[PDB]
């Protein structure tokens, strides 16, 4: 009937990943409620299940020389970028076998957040993530182990969208990327975006936030 929200603020990817895994273990064990981690990462590129070297425009070494961290991970999707101004959410929830349903719920929550800003967003029939017209507002890529989810979503709030140009996702997609800031012509407070995300998750999942 409840979910726990933890706002970790700005956390390096590697230690945040270790934290995800510890949170996941507790939820698997039934010793922690379904938990939504909300956070930001310093500039980082992650390469998921479907990722290869073609997803990086420059050599790997270029990225580390130019202020990115880079990691290979086991979430769905190929390459993505996280950085300051992007609200990263890791719902570590006991989803069981119904992963597609879970993805649709994350999508729905994000669509609600966008609607709250007067923005019409949609999952799209054909592209992973949540889109506003031809531009991706929120990336989504999860993993599930022992019936509990990890990884999650990355909502562009005040993201430096220019940082996406150096990665080259593959497969079906729209044309670009967007953020609440770009759509609204001004920065949106991160604290507010977090609150709206929490409210949307509470509504979609039918759970009370603690």
Swiss-Prot record:
It comes from the Bacteria. One of its GO terms (cellular component) is cytoplasm. GO terms for molecular function: lipoyl(octanoyl) transferase activity. It catalyses: octanoyl-[ACP] + L-lysyl-[protein] = N(6)-octanoyl-L-lysyl-[protein] + holo-[ACP] + H(+). Catalyzes the transfer of endogenously produced octanoic acid from octanoyl-acyl-carrier-protein onto the lipoyl domains of lipoate-dependent enzymes. Lipoyl-ACP can also act as a substrate although octanoyl-ACP is likely to be the physiological substrate. In the reaction, the free carboxyl group of octanoic acid is attached via an amide linkage to the epsilon-amino group of a specific lysine residue of lipoyl domains of lipoate-dependent enzymes. This is Octanoyltransferase. It comes from Thermus thermophilus (strain ATCC 27634 / DSM 579 / HB8). The lineage of its organism: Bacteria, Thermotogati, Deinococcota, Deinococci, Thermales.
């Amino acid at each position: 009937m409840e979910f726990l929200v933890e706002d970790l603020g700005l956390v390096p990817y590697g230690e945040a990943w270790a934290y995800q895994k510890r949170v996941h273990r507790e939820v698997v064990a039934g010793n922690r409620p379904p938990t939504l981690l909300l956070l930001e990462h310093p500039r980082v590129i992650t390469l998921g299940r479907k990722a290869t070297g073609e997803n990086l425009l420059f050599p790997e070494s270029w990225y580390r020389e130019n202020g990115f961290e880079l990691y290979w991970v086991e979430r769905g999707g190929d390459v993505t970028y996280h950085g300051p101004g992007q609200l990263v959410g890791y719902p570590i929830f006991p989803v069981g076998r119904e992963v597609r349903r879970f993805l649709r719920q994350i999508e729905e929550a994000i669509v609600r957040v966008a609607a709250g800003y007067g923005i019409s967003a949609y999952p799209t029939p054909g592209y992973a993530g949540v889109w506003v017209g031809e531009d991706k507002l929120c990336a989504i890529g999860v993993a599930v182990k022992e019936g509990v989810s990890f990884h999650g979503f990355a909502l562009n709030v005040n993201t430096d969208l220019n940082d996406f140009t150096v990665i080259v996702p593959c497969g079906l997609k729209g044309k670009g990327v967007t953020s609440l800031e770009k759509l609204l012509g001004r920065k949106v407070p991160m604290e507010e975006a977090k609150a709206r995300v929490v409210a949307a998750f509470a509504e979609v999942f039918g759970l009370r936030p603690v």
